[PDB]
Each structure stands twice: as structure tokens, then as C-alpha cells.
Amino acid sequence: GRSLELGAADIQDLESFEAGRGALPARAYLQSDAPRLSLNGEWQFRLSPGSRVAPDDGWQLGEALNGFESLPVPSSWPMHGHGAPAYTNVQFPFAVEPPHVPEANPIGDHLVVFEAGPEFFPHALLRFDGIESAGTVWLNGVELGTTRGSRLAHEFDVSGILEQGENTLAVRVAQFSAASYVEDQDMWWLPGIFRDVTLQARPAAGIDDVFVHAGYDHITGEGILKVEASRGGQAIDAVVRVPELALELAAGTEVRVPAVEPWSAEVPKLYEAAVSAAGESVALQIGFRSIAIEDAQFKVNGRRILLRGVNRHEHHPRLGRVVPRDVVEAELRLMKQHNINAIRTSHYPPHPQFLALADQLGFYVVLECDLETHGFESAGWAQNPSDDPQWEDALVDRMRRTVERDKNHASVVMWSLGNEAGTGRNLAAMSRWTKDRDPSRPIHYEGDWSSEHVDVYSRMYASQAETALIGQGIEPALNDAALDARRRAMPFVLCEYVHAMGNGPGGMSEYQALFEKYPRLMGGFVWEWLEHGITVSTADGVDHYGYGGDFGEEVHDGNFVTDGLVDADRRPRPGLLDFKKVIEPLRIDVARDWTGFTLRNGQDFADTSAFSFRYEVEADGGALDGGTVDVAPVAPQSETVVELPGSVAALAAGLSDGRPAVLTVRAVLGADSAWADAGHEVAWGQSVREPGAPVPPAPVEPVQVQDSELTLGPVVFSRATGMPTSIGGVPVEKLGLTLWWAPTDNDLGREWGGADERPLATQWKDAGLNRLHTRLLGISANPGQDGGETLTVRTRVSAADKQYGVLVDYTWSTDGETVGLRTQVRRDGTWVNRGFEVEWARIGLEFVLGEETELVSWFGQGPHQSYPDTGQGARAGWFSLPLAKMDVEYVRPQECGARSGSRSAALQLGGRTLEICGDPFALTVRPYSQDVLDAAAHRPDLKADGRTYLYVDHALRGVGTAACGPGVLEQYRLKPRDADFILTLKVRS
């Protein structure tokens, strides 16, 4: 009985443990003068749901194409209507039984016709820079080979197959393969030919590969140069010319350049060079820099550096894994403009042309191999490819192609073996191969905490506490004394930290202080640079970002893919504005008396000569003084005290007490740079003269009683509820206490540790904080002064089925135009639920006004949001925004938009203006309620109801990073307590 199933041969190849077949040896991506023809453009595309039904109808010949339609290449083909994107975090979307593939496996047949001139003969090749996940290539019906390693390059010799004139290239691409088991990155599954397809002629006496070695001797200032060149795998004679350095040398010999300017992220000096043979010349950019590890420190050019990094995925909200070059250049400029100096290519090699941009603009790069077996962890790592000898050749090939393609770029300061691939023999083989091939770059890999096969100790999301212990070299020892000795001598890097999902991240400052304090700490890379939002249109035709589950996924991880510092279209989130400030390379501490400021140069190589230091005094009326001050260049890691012009201090001394004024000192770019224009702000510091506490109004107005209402100055109260129904003519629909906010993404993550691991959001729902009720205890008027009186409204707030509550007393007073409101909160009973203490999100008030708000103005921190453990980027000053701009457009709507540290606020309700003053309070204004905010899964779900929701908080809790990593730090928690705060209110015109 023979087999009767269909497509067994294709499936067998997809289940292969080996790398691609028939490809040329892996080499560097090189700029060559050899003729080249990009086959990018409109191809023909046919999709089948599985290998067994994929036609075998001679389509590769390009004749009588049945069912082929136009598709752009490069492309992620679910982004163009063929199937749909699917997002999983850790879980595989298919049964875990390596190397087998599911029956539902989209098969994409690609085909293009192109013309090959005489310059592509007798020798040429076809280059595929990326195919997810398994490709089979035919040229004029002849099989060239297959591709494995979705983000790795492949080249196929077409000599003797490429015909002069017309040619037909056919590529069958399977979404899933055995390789899928080693490409389990937390991102969208997106098959397709998503990177360049190039025809390249290979003239005789040419250059196939080049290995640049450009060291730097920081003591002598010498450059140490050796440029290797090869052809057919053999070292060849070639001449290297570096005009700027006045040298001409042979390829293969090490020379010593007397004086070079070293390359660094701060100063990305690049020397143009060319290596050429008889038939081919290659253009190179050489950055002289040496990487070393000594005294448990990661050093470049003799100096410990601080990594100010982000994890960079490759994503585009409409093109998937295809990132247009202009978007790449733009986002890298945006990175530099926010003081970022390092990038981790999470978790695969980037587009080949990315690295030249990193060399030029200046980033310390961690270039990561395309390897991740995260989905095997849930089974105790059973069958993990990283430890299965059958996968050794496949994984070594991945590392080899990774190293070879990018080995020439100065920006690459570390090789990374992969991400969350467990531990295993194959990872060790990948390390041995890299160390032997390129000893000039340390090896990184977080998955093996013993650090046996790496040169740096890496972790992800380690708490601030553990980072401090590691920074001091006092973390607990490894069981193996030899391995422990090796790891204690390593510097420490956080390859991922301060998870930037939604509102947040909190606790960035605590990490940064440790980075600066402890030399063993190399820094960290934020997770993540961008959100993987995919643009989606509503039924009405309105755009919004979609995430996991929005594309019919059976298995998905929701909005975990939107966890970035910028949105998919590179619009900054508030977290990026705080991050920029946190990692600012200069520290400016303005003296309290405004006589000067302390300036610390936190850079590693550059002085302060590139910066202009400017000062401005601003008051309510506007700018009162300002200018520039000359600062003798401060060396890196040194500091000085800079005197400010006497007019500034004199101005401060002359300010009448209680008048607010802000002195801001800024360090800006004196001249244009490659990544920003002159005047771009790099660092800043402030000193504030705080406005005096607000004086309560005199209680001279009395309480006028009627059957259904009480009136006190401009306030009309409902006698049935005791709450105001009108203030200065502004209708007040509701006023009450608040202890809860719409859970953030962090609030939805588990609070690991302790007997309670419910997410904070669940603790809140269980405790009833989202559904508070208020009982009126009494209302009474009391003698004020000169015939006036105060109005005290006693209430108790609690929730259904709970015995705990808070007594809340509102004491109202007015002089005729200013209303004084004193709120006093007292706990009644122990706030415990399901055996665990309840925590509060805030202690504040909610004013629901019966009219819309057009404009919100305030004095405090701004312009963007700030919570207790965030808001570093929000500076003191006066701000004014239309209501819509107070909000934050997170993909999943959640708590956001609070302005902490506010002293005064003004809401423009049509013709009238409501002014709120008081001791420091957080300010939030929205056109929709908190329940609408919490219920909303996407932004279109938010709809204005014609009201104004004003939140005035006496206290807030932090936002932390509980979605992944540490929760809110102790000092930012908000446990139930008694509280009393005063406000003044006033309506105008």
C-alpha cells in the first residue's frame, strides 16, 4: 500500500532541519561598482492555503498563469489583502511538534519577468535580502535553491541559467516551516518577500567579500587598519585607498595610521575608503574604534560608555516588515533628537542598509541573530531547538550569515546570539563560531544567566533593586565557582527594561541613577522603540490602530504588540518625552538663588563645545529676561559651576513674595548637526519661585435656604443631595470623591510576588473602587464672619457589599466671587478585600459639568502628562491646550492625560472661564466619563457626551511597569489614608 496523501514532498522540505540549499557562501553586504538590477516592483502573486493544494501547474515558466494577480515586492503579503496579520507574543500559533508544520500553511507563489543585458554575463547572481519563512527559487524553470533565515540574505549563482534578454524569476514562499520554531519573536507573523531582490553581475577579477579591521589605540592616537579581501573564498590581491588619511596599502596587511579621529556614537567620524581589484571596486566607510572589557566595564576607545538605547523592531503600520528608507532615516533622526545613542536590533538583523545609517548618525548597535525559541519555555524547554543537535547546522548558519553581512560596520559593538532561546549546545556552537570568526566584538545573549558562552552579563526587566546589587558586584554567586568568577568580571547590560506599554513607563529615573553611579552597569535598552500598530478603517472610514485579535486570530496576545515609545507612525508617546530627559547627556542644576547653575558633562568623549547655553526667566506676563552665557568647554565626566548674569539673580531677589516665576537654563545645539538643526534642545534645568498658597475667601456671604435648593454666593446646591448643581452659572451635573482610574496596561499585568497576584485592575474591580456610592449624612450651615456662613456637607463613600468606606466632608465658603472648598477624607473601617489590603489609584474629586470645554490652561508641569513616577520631561511653566490635545491617543484607551504638580487651572467653557486654584494637585479634563474610557478597546469607542469631566486629585499613585517588569515602586504606592485639601474656585465673564 503506497502513500496516497498529496504534497508530501513539499511538506518534507518545509520540515527540513537544514539551512537553505544551493546558495553561495555568506558574505558582507558591500557597495560595489559592479552592475546591478533591482527586480523590485509589481510582481505576480497567487495564494494557496496549504502545500497539498498548492498547484503544480508549471507556473514557474510564467505561461498561462491561472489565478495570479499583481502584488508589490518587497511586501508582507497579509498587508495587501491576502490573508491577514496574526499576532502572538510567546505562544506559537501552531501545535508545537517540531519540525512539523500545520495543514493551514499559506503558500505564496511569486513571479516576475525581467530583462538582463550583456553586462550581466557571463557571471551574475540573484540576491534575496529577506523571505519569511521558507522560499524556493526558480529561474527560467531551473531550481536555484531554498532560503532559511527569514531576515538573512541569500545569493544564488545564475551563471548559465540567466539568459540574455527576457528571464522569468519564480519564488514559492511558505509562511510556516521548521524555521518557524526558531523565529518566535513577539511580533506580527507576516510572510512574504519583504526585502530587496537584486540581480548583480560578478565580473572576473572582482571582490566577493571584504572584512574591515579598524582599531584605535587611545594612548597613542593611532589607527590600526587591516582590510581583508577575497574572491571565491580565497584572499586576493587588492589595493586599499583612504584618501583623507593619505595612505595606499595592500589588502591583507595590518598597518598603523599615526593619528586618526576615533569613531563613537557621540562623534561618528567616518573615513571614506575604496578597496579595488582589476574587475571590481568596493566603497567603504571606516570608523576607527576598539572595544574592550576590563575591570568589569564595557569600554570603547579606552573609556567606559553609557548605553542610552532602545529595542528597534522593523514594522510599518501599512507595509508590515517593509520599512521605507525615508521612515528609517526619519526615525533614527528622531532617536538622536531624544538623546538615544544605542540600538538593539530586536530580534533579528535589520535591513542591510540600516547599518550605514547607524555608522553615520552614531549609534552603539547590538546586532542580533535571527533566533528565538520562546514558545518552548512553557514545556520546560523540552524539544528546544537550541539544544537539539539536529538544529546545529541551521543555527550556526543563522549566526554565520548574521556576522558576515554586517562585520564591516563600526556601529556594531556587540554580536547577540538571539533572544529568549533558552540554553543549549547549539547556542554554544554559535558563540564559538563568532568568537573565532570575529574576536573584535563581545558576544551578548541574555537567555543563559550563567553567561558561560558570552562576554557581558545581560538581563531583561531586572528590578532596580537587583540592578543596584549587580552594579556593586554583590549579587548571589553562581553554583559553579569558575562560571561565577567569569561573570563577576563581566559588565552588566539590561537588553530590555522599563517596558513602555501604554501609560508609562515609570521608574526610569531610579535605573538611570544606578547607571551613572556604578561603572559595571553599561546601561539599558528600552522595550520598545515603536508600537506595532496596524492601520485599520472603521465602518465610517475613520483610521485607528489595530492589535492582536483585531484580525480574526484564533490565538493572540491582544495589545501587547503596541508597547512602544512612539506609535507605528513614529508619533512620540509621553514616555519618549520623559525618556529623553532621563537620559539627557548633560545635567544642569540651577541654583536656588538664581546666581548660576552646576553643569555636569555626562558624555563619554565629547566636551560641551557643541552646545549653546541659554537662560530665560518667565512669569505670568511672559518672558522677563533671557540670553546666552559663555561656558568654557567642560571635559567629559567633569563638571563646573557657571555664573549667570547678575540681572537674573537681581530679578529673583526683587520678586514680591508669592509671585510665580521660572528660571530655565537650556543646552541647545549651537550649529546644525546631521540629526537636528541648531537650537535643538538637548538638556535643561529649572528653578521655580512657587506661587504662595491660595488665600481662602472670607466667609461673608450667607446661605440662602429654599425648599429644594440652597444658594451660597455663586453656588447653587441641591438640598436633596447636598452637592452643587451650579457654580457661577456653570451647570454642575455631579461632584463626588474618586479613588479609581481606568486601568492602564500596567494595571492589567500581574503583581508578581506575595500571596496576591491578581492584577491591580482586578483588585480594584473586586473591591468595588470603580462603582463607588455616596450616602448623605447631613447638611448644616455654620457662622462665618460679618453675617456670612459656611456650608458643611457630610457624606460617606463606599461600595455595594463592602463594609469599608471613607467619610468625606465638604466645607464651602464664599465672599461673593471666590468659592472656598475644603475636603476632608477619613477612613471608616479597614480597607481589606479578599484578605488583601486595597490600594487606591488616587484621592481626588470629579466635577461633571453640563457644558463642553474648549480650552484648558494651567500653571505647573507640562505640556504633556505627568504621574508620580513619570513626567520627567514635563517642565515647570504656563501651558494652554485645546481639550482634544490634553488626551493621549493610546491604541487601547486607558487612564492618561493627568497633569501632576498643578497650582492653578483654567477651563474655558464657552464664554465663561472656570478657575481652580489650590495646593499642588493633578489636573485632568475629558469629554467622556471614566467608564466610557475603561470600556473602550479602541479609540473610536470614545465619544463625547456634551459634558466636561474635570478631575482634581490631591494624590495619585504611580504607573510603574507591571505589564512586564517591576510594578509601582514603594515610594509611589497609594495606600488608604486620611487626607484634607483645600481648593478655591471662580467663574468669570
Ligand X SMILES: OC[C@H]1O[C@@H](O)[C@H](O)[C@@H](O)[C@H]1O
Binding-site ranges for ligand X (CB under 6 A): 89, 186, 346, 419-420, 496, 527, 964
How many Å apart are CA 551 and CA 563, to the nearest integer? 18
Give strand ranges (E) for 530-585. Answer: 534-537, 543-546
Among ligand X, Na ion, its own copies, none, the one that 502 touches (CB under a kind-dependent 5 to 8 A) is: Na ion
- Give the residue with the Cβ less far from its own copies, 798 or 865: 798
In the list 9, 12, 38, 53, the residue contacting its own copies (rule: CB under 8 A) is: 53
Q: CA 964: distance to chain centroid?
A: 13
- Give the residue with the Cβ less far from ligand X, 296 or 427: 427
Q: Do 608 and 635 meet the contact criterion of CB atoms below 8 Å apart?
A: no
- Give the residue with the Cβ less far from ligand X, 420 or 934: 420
Helices 508-517 and 574-582, axial angle in degrees (round to 10): 20
Residue 773 touches its own copies, criterion: CB under 8 A: yes
Residue 765 touches its own copies, criterion: CB under 8 A: no
Residue 785 touches its own copies, criterion: CB under 8 A: no
Residue that is written with C-alpha cell 536555484 in the block: 144
419 is in an annotated binding site: yes
Residue 929 touches its own copies, criterion: CB under 8 A: no
269 is in an annotated binding site: no
In the list 75, 105, 423, 426, the residue contacting Na ion (rule: CB under 5 A) is: 105
Cis upstream peptide for 528 (omega within 30°) = yes
Scan residues 549-568 and list those touching Na ion (CB under 5 A).
560, 562-563
- Give the residue with the Cβ less far from ligand X, 339 or 419: 419
CA dihedral 847, 876, 818, 955 (to 10 degrees): 40
Residue that is written with C-alpha cell 504534497 in the block: 7
Question: x-or-dash pattern for Na ion, window 513-552, by CB under 5 A?
Answer: ----------------------------------------
Q: Least distance (Å) from ligand X to the CB of residue 347?
A: 6
Close Cβ partners of 536 (under 8 Å, ≥ 6 residues apart):
543, 544, 545, 546, 550
3-state secondary structure of 618: strand
3-state secondary structure of 496: strand
The C-alpha cell at 814 is 464664599
- Give the residue with the Cβ less far from its own copies, 383 or 929: 383
Selecting among 314, 368, 420, 475, the annotated active-site residue is 420
293 is in an annotated binding site: yes
Among Na ion, its own copies, ligand X, none, the one that 722 touches (CB under a kind-dependent 5 to 8 A) is: its own copies
Among its own copies, Na ion, ligand X, none, the one that 419 touches (CB under a kind-dependent 5 to 8 A) is: ligand X
- Give the residue with the Cβ less far from its own copies, 158 or 703: 703
Residue 774 touches its own copies, criterion: CB under 8 A: yes
Q: What are the angstrom distances between the C-alpha of 538 and each of 542, 613, 937, 939, 940? A: 5, 48, 13, 11, 8
Q: Contacts with its own copies: how many residues (CB under 8 A)? A: 58
Q: Contacts with Na ion: how many residues (CB under 5 A)? A: 9
Pairing mode of beta strands 819-828, 805-814: antiparallel
In the list 638, 704, 780, 971, the residue contacting its own copies (rule: CB under 8 A) is: 780
- Give the residue with the Cβ less far from its own copies, 16 or 509: 16
Stretch that binds its own copies, among 201-209, 636-644, 768-776, 957-965 (CB under 8 A): 768-776
Q: What are the angstrom distances between the C-alpha of 119 and each of 24, 37, 983? A: 20, 10, 81
Residue 100 touches its own copies, criterion: CB under 8 A: yes
Close Cβ partners of 540 (under 8 Å, ≥ 6 residues apart):
none
3-state secondary structure of 764: helix
- Give the residue with the Cβ less far from its own copies, 238 or 772: 772
Residue 757 touches its own copies, criterion: CB under 8 A: no
Residue 848 touches its own copies, criterion: CB under 8 A: no
Residue 805 touches its own copies, criterion: CB under 8 A: yes
Sheet containing 586-590: give its strands across. Answer: 586-590, 596-601, 639-643
Q: Least distance (Å) from its own copies to the CB of residue 852?
A: 27
Residue 787 touches its own copies, criterion: CB under 8 A: no
Residue 67 touches its own copies, criterion: CB under 8 A: no
Q: List the one residue out of 229, 274, 222, 234 whose CA is nearest residue 253.
A: 229
Among Na ion, ligand X, its own copies, none, the one that 420 touches (CB under a kind-dependent 5 to 8 A) is: ligand X
Residue of minimal CB distance from ligand X?
186
570 is in an annotated binding site: no
Instruction: For residue 681, indicate whether it is catalytic.
Output: no
Residue 383 touches its own copies, criterion: CB under 8 A: yes
100 is in an annotated binding site: no
Residues in the chain: 989
Selecting among 280, 496, 839, 895, the annotated active-site residue is 496
How many Å apart are CA 921 and CA 24, to the nearest integer? 66
290 is in an annotated binding site: no
- Give the residue with the Cβ less far from its own copies, 326 or 707: 707
Residue that is written with C-alpha cell 473601617 in the block: 829
Q: What are the angstrom distances between the C-alpha of 170 and each of 134, 141, 717? A: 14, 8, 78
Residue 95 touches its own copies, criterion: CB under 8 A: yes
501 is in an annotated binding site: no
In the list 783, 816, 882, 910, the residue contacting its own copies (rule: CB under 8 A) is: 783
How many Å apart are CA 474 and CA 741, to the nearest integer? 40
How many Å apart are CA 875 and CA 580, to the nearest integer? 13
Among its own copies, Na ion, ligand X, none, the one that 527 touches (CB under a kind-dependent 5 to 8 A) is: ligand X
The C-alpha cell at 615 is 537662560
- Give the residue with the Cβ less far from Na ion, 51 or 458: 51
Q: What are the angstrom distances between the C-alpha of 980 and each of 46, 86, 463, 797, 918? A: 69, 51, 34, 15, 12
896 is in an annotated binding site: no
3-state secondary structure of 960: coil
Q: Least distance (Å) from ligand X to the CB of residue 501?
A: 8
Instruction: For residue 846, indicate whether it is catalytic.
Output: no
689 is in an annotated binding site: no
Close Cβ partners of 915 (under 8 Å, ≥ 6 residues apart):
904, 905, 906, 985, 986, 987, 988
CA dihedral 335, 338, 339, 340 (to 10 degrees): -30
Quickly list DSSP for 831-878.
-EETTEE---SEEEEEEEESS---EEEEEEEESS-B-TT--TTPEEEE
943 is in an annotated binding site: no
In the list 362, 502, 504, 714, the residue contacting Na ion (rule: CB under 5 A) is: 502
Q: Do 510 and 474 meet the contact criterion of CB atoms below 8 Å apart?
A: no
Q: Residue 913 burial (CB < 10 Å; 0-12/13-18/19+)? A: middle
- Give the residue with the Cβ less far from its own copies, 176 or 518: 176
The C-alpha cell at 922 is 493633578
Binding residues: 23-24, 26, 186, 196, 228, 230, 291, 293, 325, 336, 339-340, 401, 419-420, 435, 437, 460, 496, 499, 563, 773-774, 964
Binding residues for beta-D-galactose: 23-24, 26, 186, 196, 325, 336, 339-340, 419-420, 460, 496, 499, 563, 773-774, 964
Binding residues for beta-D-fructose: 24, 26, 228, 230, 401, 437
Q: Which residues are catalytic?
A: 420, 496
Chain residues that interact with its own copies, rule: CB under 8 A: 1-8, 50, 52-53, 88, 90-97, 100, 102-104, 375, 378-379, 382-383, 554-555, 703, 705, 710, 719-722, 771, 773-776, 778-783, 789, 796, 798-803, 805
